């Protein structure tokens, strides 16, 4: 809690009232980790950030349906 209160991640501090565990994930691969925790229904993911953009769970599952990064670069 002090490292979240003093740094730029103060908006993530309300997600830490119970037993919470962190999913540190270099090179974000979000679709398949959603696909492996959709096996167990009782496991929430309360949110987090994606590259300094704080996002919710339904935000995560609609972030997974962003198109592939080459075509996202090639749209503009």
């Amino acid at each position: 809690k002090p490292f979240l209160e003093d740094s730029k991640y103060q908006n993530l501090l309300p997600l830490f009232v119970g037993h919470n565990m962190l999913l540190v994930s270099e090179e974000p691969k979000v679709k398949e980790m959603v696909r492996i925790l959709r096996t167990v229904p009782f496991l929430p993911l309360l949110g987090g950030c994606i590259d300094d953009t704080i996002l919710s769970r339904q935000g995560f599952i609609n972030y997974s349906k962003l198109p592939s990064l080459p075509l996202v670069q090639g749209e503009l």
Binding site: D51, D52, Y63, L66, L69, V72, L76
Partner: peptide, 27 residues
């Protein structure tokens, strides 16, 4: 006109998504 180069290289993923949304609706 490489100002575009710098301010789009500083652009994040969903930042580029917002740019896509805005310019496509405008264009």
């Amino acid at each position: 006109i490489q100002q575009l180069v710098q301010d789009i290289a500083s652009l994040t993923l969903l930042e580029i998504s917002d740019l896509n949304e805005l310019l496509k609706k405008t264009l």
